[model samples]
Target: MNECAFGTKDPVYLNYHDHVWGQPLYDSKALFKLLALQSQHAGLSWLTILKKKEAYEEAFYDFEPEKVAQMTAQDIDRLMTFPNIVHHRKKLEAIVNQAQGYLKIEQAYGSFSKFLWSYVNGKPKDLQYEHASDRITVDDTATQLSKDLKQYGFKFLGPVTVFSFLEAAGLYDAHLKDCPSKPKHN
Candidate 1:
């Protein structure tokens, strides 16, 4: 089967690329998962995180904002023992902080999906490119989104990471022009 031009040949990356990587997701829980995973990717390759996705889902209680938001220092202390994922103290704190921020956004916009999608005017931006090299890892949208999210009390969501989320969550379609899934989906 044909795979997304930007993804690696690894099964994890390929599965995500083919199934959900560039799909527009309006679900709040899914949005939370993407945001959390993107933050966990702060200084690491996504392939590593993608490979341990199940561990993350289980450790973080399936990315439920309420559960993660209520996580205490002890919970983080316990999660640090999970060998499959990054166990940095600051990263753990960031996840809880992000969960709180997510809760706030949900309260304000009725859902985190609504709050986030509002940035794109409720529509995903489709980009045309010829190669993976043509795609930028950071851009104006990432800058603005990162800045705004920080102002709202999120951490580890720098421009690059924000761009990653933008790409993964299908806020922007960066599928190369030659990709079979490009025109058909976007």
Candidate 2:
């Protein structure tokens, strides 16, 4: 069988696809990490980020929201020197800024999951399609979401990138029915 369209031949990516991608992430930490990583992938291949996942985890302190939120400019400087990971300055700054925003979201909604899922009214969108190619790379929903996120002080979250996050975070499952993991609503 052909692999999931998002998964390459790499074992790491395959595992992420089989287990995490398109799965509802209720945990705030996981949700934040996915969002941050997705932004870091702007103008880059997902595979590059996947291969450097460990370095990212290390650099960002295992994706801990509290620690990352407290990161200083020096911390960002050190991260830029790390090998095997995207070292874009704005992306690095966003990681820290997003963590701070995440805390605010948690306070406002009792948890980031509650805040985020509420956007979809707490249900995943199920769509019919034959393959990933059938999926629209950007949509009105994503554009609106991206605009709102930017208004709330987020960066690197354009419509296309936000749509990618929507798919990855299971806000919408674009998986085809014939695929091993078909889209499901809750």
Candidate 3:
């Protein structure tokens, strides 16, 4: 099947699919950035979030956990009225909470990327998909990761969100077999 068959109509989605999604992203703060964005996707389509990605980067200080952890109630209140954002207080607040959680992970594991990659032995777990039948949206690994994040006080990320986050972070290579954007095997 072609990329268009998987709903890449929007240019933003096309760019993300072709260059970003499922590609290896092992940086500490970079993972948090996508995780924070995924948190915002709780009840919305990813396209909605992708469309406002720039605004989000600006609003959250490029998702730097150190800076985001410093965000205060005023920040949340201010973002509540910000344009091109979800504006949900808890969703906005989730980023701050996740920032704190991200810091904790760093302290515990020396780096957030190390901790996340440890689950898969520091390599991406590539999945085989011939024609995009069952996408396997949720699984045990994601559930466990979700629970671990909860232990660190992260919010708004359940198994479904965590699964998507893993894919986005490149912990799980989920691109279709014939998709041109699929990572080349070494």
Candidate 4:
């Protein structure tokens, strides 16, 4: 078996780090879901987020941006008590705000996917490192992505969140050179 920078023996983490992580995803719903999940990572391990993915799906209507954008205050109030998710009220509402902001991107770029990909002309970035910490330890494009998202009224997406989104969504592939999943996923 190949070694993954972030994978452990746990089946869920292994599966996600291998099969899902760094795979280029162009779907708007999937991107929205990832942005939400990545933000929720502020207080927990990625494994925790992976494990609770199903609960997130259920709570967020499978990440359909239109539905999430339509969520009301009562929806936020209700979802705050949702058992399986992290259930941070600020985080929950941030997802809804971003969902609505996503539409404006679509209007301008014709697809949210297009707007994100346009940054690097649909090419992936080579992190060019041997260790995980070496890859994302300092300044990078995520700062710009975060700033851009904030300008659009998106909430809770920091550089760390956007960088993960950049990698996971294929906007940028930070996969180490030896990793099996790479730009081909783009």
* Among all candidates shown, the one with the greatest TM-score: 3
Clash totals in order: 0, 0, 0, 0
Assess each prediction's global lDDT (C-alpha) against the native: 0.81, 0.80, 0.87, 0.77
What TM-score, to 2 decimals, does candidate 3 have? 0.95
TM-score of each: 0.91, 0.90, 0.95, 0.89
- Deviation (Å) of 162 in candidate 2: 1.0
Model 1 TM-score is 0.91
Give per-residue lDDT, candidate 2, residue 162: 88
Off by over 4 Å in 4: 1-3, 183-186
Candidate 1 structure quality by residue, lDDT tens digits, 1-88: 3435454677777777767776788888898889888898866777888898899888888889898889999998899997787888
lDDT of 3 by residue, 21-135 (tens): 8998988888889999999997687889999999999899989899999999999999998888888999999999999999998888788989889888899898866667647
Pitting candidate 1 against candidate 2, the one with the higher TM-score is: 1
RMSD of each: 2.0, 2.0, 1.4, 2.1
How big is the positional error of residue 20 in model 4, measured in Å on the Cα after superposition? Answer: 0.9
**Candidate that beats the other on lDDT, 1 or 3, i.e. the better one:** 3
Off by over 4 Å in 3: 1-5
